[PDB]
Design a protein around this ligand. Structure first.
Ligand SMILES: O[C@@H]1[C@@H](O)[C@H](O[C@@H]2CO[C@@H](O)[C@H](O)[C@H]2O)OC[C@H]1O
Ligand SMILES: *[C@@H]1O[C@H](CO)[C@@H](O)[C@H](O)[C@H]1NC(C)=O
Length: 379
């Protein structure tokens, strides 16, 4: 129904941010339904240029569940048609007592996350580093995911992490005795795990609420804006450095980090893949490594997609200073809880959150230099 999905745009060359509202073939988006097809195209482009191949659900996915006290263990097996299998067993921390009729809402927290989780929400601890190692460039192709698909599989570590989240949600769908409301699943992570959580929410449509925390470069920052920051003297993480530091991106991305204008996506399109579902990301201006201006401009550009879909308040951004990396400032708890309350707890909470302190160091944000499109009202 979307036709043949384009996965490359060989002639692309755009120093500003790619236009969310124009397909690779030059067709303009017009309807809300068009966004589903555009999202599928962005997925293919992101896989091709920076994330590697995200495998589909494998033929074998088995799950069993057991509970001791308030801790559940979800034992998952995943297997291919060639008989290869891997296994992993995330745990779930439950609120006590009788659950809601449809089960507990749940946040999948990469290695526990760094946000406070309200008392009526269960927490699943996902050991993403075991699914795909992330110590340094030395970690390439190591982790459970690669014991299934092969150490030379093109998936980045973050794409392998997404795959694991998808198997977790498969297992939850198969395991009603885990007492989870599978329509009310969120995801969160901080720092490198916040890069991971954004990827999970973008690519796995069953996630109702995505919460990336101080994800920086390769998260809710854009590659093109971070290149501008580093060229003008801010000591930011950028595309060139990040592919040498770790294995969060595919080896193919190495071919583009010096040629960012030729990449027909940026992370504003990655973030927009969450639409029309909900996301709020949190940033910290104390660390220029995180590329503060790039995150504000990137999420401002991503925001236009929700605006065009008539659901601006489903996308939040809050950027402040004055606290340590991955420490949670109580000043932002109301904004976090507004999104959890609305999108996971079914409350009538307002979620209009889009704020920065503009503390961007040696650069400023100038929307007209980066965002070239007007926002259409998709019909
Ligand atoms: O050593 C790296 C190579 O492994 C990488 O190879 C790319 C992998 O994905 C394919 O789609 C590309 O065609 C191929 O070039 O190139 C970069 C290099 O650093
Ligand atoms: C352009 O590409 C999109 C996405 O694949 C597709 O939905 C649309 O039909 C294409 N346009 C034409 C004229 O085929």
């Amino acid at each position: 129904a979307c036709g043949a999905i384009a996965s490359t745009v060989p002639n692309y060359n755009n120093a500003k941010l790619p236009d969310p509202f124009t397909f690779a073939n030059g067709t303009a988006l017009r309807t809300k339904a068009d966004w589903s097809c555009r999202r599928a195209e962005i997925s293919a482009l992101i896989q091709n240029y920076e994330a590697g191949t995200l495998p589909p659900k494998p033929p074998v996915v088995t799950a069993s569940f057991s509970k001791s006290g308030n801790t559940g263990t979800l034992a998952i097996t995943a297997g291919l048609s060639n008989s290869q299998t891997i296994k992993f067993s995330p745990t779930i921390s439950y609120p006590s007592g009788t659950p809601p009729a449809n089960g507990w809402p749940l946040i999948i927290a990469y290695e526990g996350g760094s946000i406070p989780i309200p008392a009526g929400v269960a927490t699943l601890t996902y050991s993403n580093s075991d699914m795909a190692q992330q110590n340094s460039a030395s970690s390439r192709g190591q982790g459970l995911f690669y014991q299934l698909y092969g150490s030379t599989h093109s998936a980045s570590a973050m794409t392998a992490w997404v795959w694991g989240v998808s198997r977790i949600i498969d297992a939850l769908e198969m395991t009603p005795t885990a007492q989870i409301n599978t329509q009310r699943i969120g995801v969160t992570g901080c720092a490198r795990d916040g890069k991971g959580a954004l990827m999970a929410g973008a690519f796995e449509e069953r996630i109702a609420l995505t919460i990336p925390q101080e994800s920086g470069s390769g998260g809710d920052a854009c590659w093109r804006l971070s290149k501008y920051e580093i060229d003008n003297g801010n000591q930011v993480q950028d595309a060139v450095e990040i592919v040498g530091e770790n294995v969060w991106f595919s080896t193919n991305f190495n071919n583009y980090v010096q040629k960012l204008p030729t990449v027909p996506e940026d992370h504003h399109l990655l973030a927009a893949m969450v639409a029309p579902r909900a996301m709020i990301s949190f940033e910290n201006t104390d660390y220029l490594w995180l590329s503060p201006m790039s995150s504000f401009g990137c999420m401002t550009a991503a925001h236009t997609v929700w605006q065009g879909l008539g659901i601006a308040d489903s996308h939040g951004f809050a950027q402040v200073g004055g606290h340590a990396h991955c420490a949670w400032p109580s000043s932002l708890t109301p904004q976090l809880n507004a999104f959890i309350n609305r999108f996971l707890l079914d409350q009538s909470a307002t979620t209009n959150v889009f704020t920065t302190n503009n503390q961007f160091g040696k650069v400023q944000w100038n929307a007209a230099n980066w965002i070239t499109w007007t926002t259409p009202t998709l019909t």
